[PDB]
């Protein structure tokens, strides 16, 4: 079935691999070579998760947990039941995600639109690859990656964070959080602004973009503009994820102490370290 305006866009073309061989849809979904690739990677990854659940003895999705190899395996391969399944599933997930992004690129090309969306999605993939690939390789073991389980990967975040004291003191982490909070603030404001113009007070004509500019100028003295706010939302969310990847790629590679030490440089500067009083004297 199609949306009422959709047929005119379902033309051949835009694929990057395979010519027209995979150039078709299944219901609403576009296929393409990377749709087929996505299906293969995802189906196999899901099969190996089911395998690992069989070995674990549970079908409870809240208990299934696929653990990476023990640290002693270093960067080597491991037996299926002792980290190998995690290893193959990780390859499958990487393959599915990258195939997803390239499928989007084919969709972008058939529709004649910019490539911003798979470019943005690539930041999420790089954050995933930081945690399971780049950081484990640089630390010397797959076993530093997170396990694939609903609650056990939260225990991994807890264990990893408290290895460094209060992880709040990681400064790149502070920047990432600031981008995450500011992004949600901006998303709330942007959704509210548009809806407040399109759904005005009862008894009113639909507002214009000039009402949006005026509202935000009256409120805080600046309106970033309709183009500006979408650039801004993209930059905030991408920067949060960039600084997330940055705060973790340095943790355990070039920084090993309690993160609260980083700022203590400021504390013990020779010209005020020993002044009696305050907090740091």
């Amino acid at each position: 079935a199609l949306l009422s305006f959709e047929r005119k866009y379902r033309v051949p073309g835009g694929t990057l691999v395979g010519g027209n061989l995979f150039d078709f849809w299944v219901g609403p979904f576009y296929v393409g070579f990377f749709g087929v690739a996505t299906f293969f990677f995802a189906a196999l990854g899901i099969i190996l998760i089911a395998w690992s659940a069989v070995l674990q003895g549970t079908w409870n999705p809240q208990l299934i947990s696929v653990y990476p190899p023990a640290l002693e395996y270093g960067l080597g391969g491991a037996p299926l039941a002792k980290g190998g399944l995690w290893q193959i599933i990780t390859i499958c997930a990487t393959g599915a995600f990258v195939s997803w992004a390239l499928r989007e690129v084919e969709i972008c090309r058939k529709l004649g639109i910019g490539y911003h969306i798979p470019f943005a999605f690539a930041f999420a993939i790089l954050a995933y690859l930081t945690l399971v690939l780049f950081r484990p390789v640089m630390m010397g073991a797959w076993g530093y990656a997170f396990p694939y389980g609903i609650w056990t990967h939260l225990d991994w975040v807890s264990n990893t964070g408290y290895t460094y004291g209060n992880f709040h003191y990681n400064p790149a982490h502070m920047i990432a959080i600031t981008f995450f909070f500011t992004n949600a603030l901006a998303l709330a404001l942007h959704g509210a602004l548009v809806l407040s113009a399109a759904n005005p007070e009862k008894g009113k004509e639909m507002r214009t973009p000039d009402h949006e500019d005026t509202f935000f100028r009256d409120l805080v003295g600046y309106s970033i503009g309709t183009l500006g706010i979408h650039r801004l939302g993209l930059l905030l969310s991408l920067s949060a994820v960039f600084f997330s990847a940055l705060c973790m790629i340095i943790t355990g590679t070039i920084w090993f102490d309690q993160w609260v030490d980083w700022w203590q440089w400021w504390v013990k500067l020779p010209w005020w370290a020993n002044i009696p009083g305050g907090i740091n004297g």
Binding site: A120, T226, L236, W263, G281
Partner: protein
């Protein structure tokens, strides 16, 4: 190098836009400010005008009195030494009364009383700012969506500093005013309550915080990808669907099997963000008042 419309190539400038009037009391609207070529690379260059008004000045006066009360406490904690001030800036903290004082307003100035005074001023600053987000939209004939979304943020802030402390029985439960101290407060809160990762309202709050970045990256990128058809002019696209709105929808339909409208994506957006602090506020409010230990509580449910 194909152009991607993240930064402007050619800036243009004309007479300042003074804005819509509708029912805005122009007596309280400043003149227009200067233009910023720096900002014009990314968004609009025009600064101002801003609306003042009684609620604004009350909010500003009170918000500055909050900031000054904390600041004066910091100078006192620093022995009035400016170098000690700058050195320990992030370590100072205006702390609430000790638990012995309960909800009493009799805690002496230097042991919690100044925290109460700063909190009074903050309480007045936020709620009059909230009134301002409502009255600015109403003066312009607009929906009240901004004030309603802002209420969700205020909900979490009210829980942290007011509602939960009162239900727990003492101001000592409230968040202190300092950079590092309020971070230490946050860490301690979770340890005291049996791992906040197992507070299901905390897990929802995270789902919507991550989901807000997921959605704004999706939507921001989508609108830039269709800005070559005027996509960011979302109101007229709502009124009169164009090829921008149609291609944006079909990208997502073809990618994930369903899609939005130019209007409806902004409903997805406002709820994704609002639910962050809505669920978050519920999660904090239940901590200690109802659930002592989220991990233990989770295992029994």
């Amino acid at each position: 190098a194909e152009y991607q419309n993240i930064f402007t190539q050619v800036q243009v400038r004309g007479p300042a836009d003074l804005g819509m009037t509708e029912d805005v009391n122009l007596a309280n609207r400043s003149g227009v400010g200067p233009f910023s070529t720096l900002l014009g690379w990314f968004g609009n260059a025009q600064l101002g005008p801003i609306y003042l008004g009684s609620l604004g000045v009350l909010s500003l006066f009170s918000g500055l009195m909050w900031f000054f009360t904390i600041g004066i406490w910091f100078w006192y904690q620093a022995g009035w030494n400016p170098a000690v001030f700058l050195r320990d800036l992030f370590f100072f903290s205006l702390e609430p009364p000790a638990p012995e004082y309960g909800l009493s307003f009799a805690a002496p100035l230097k042991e919690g009383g100044l925290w109460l005074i700063a909190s009074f001023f903050m309480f007045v600053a936020v709620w009059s700012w909230w009134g301002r987000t409502y009255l600015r939209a109403q003066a312009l004939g607009m929906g009240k969506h901004t004030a309603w979304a802002f209420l969700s943020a205020i909900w979490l802030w009210m829980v942290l500093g007011f509602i939960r402390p009162i239900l727990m029985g003492s101001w000592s439960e409230a968040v202190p005013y300092g950079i590092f101290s309020h971070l230490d407060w946050t860490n301690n809160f979770s340890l005291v309550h049996g791992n906040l990762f197992y507070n299901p309202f905390h897990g929802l709050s995270i789902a919507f915080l991550y989901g807000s970045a997921l959605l704004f990256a999706m939507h921001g990128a989508t609108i830039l990808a269709v800005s070559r058809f005027g996509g960011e002019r979302e109101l007229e696209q709502i009124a009169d669907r164009g090829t921008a709105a149609e291609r944006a929808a079909l990208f997502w339909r073809w990618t994930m099997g369903f899609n939005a409208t130019m209007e409806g994506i902004h409903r997805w957006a406002i709820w994704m963000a609002v639910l962050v602090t809505l669920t978050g506020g519920i999660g904090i409010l239940l901590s200690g008042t109802v659930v002592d230990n989220w991990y233990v509580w989770g295992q029994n449910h």
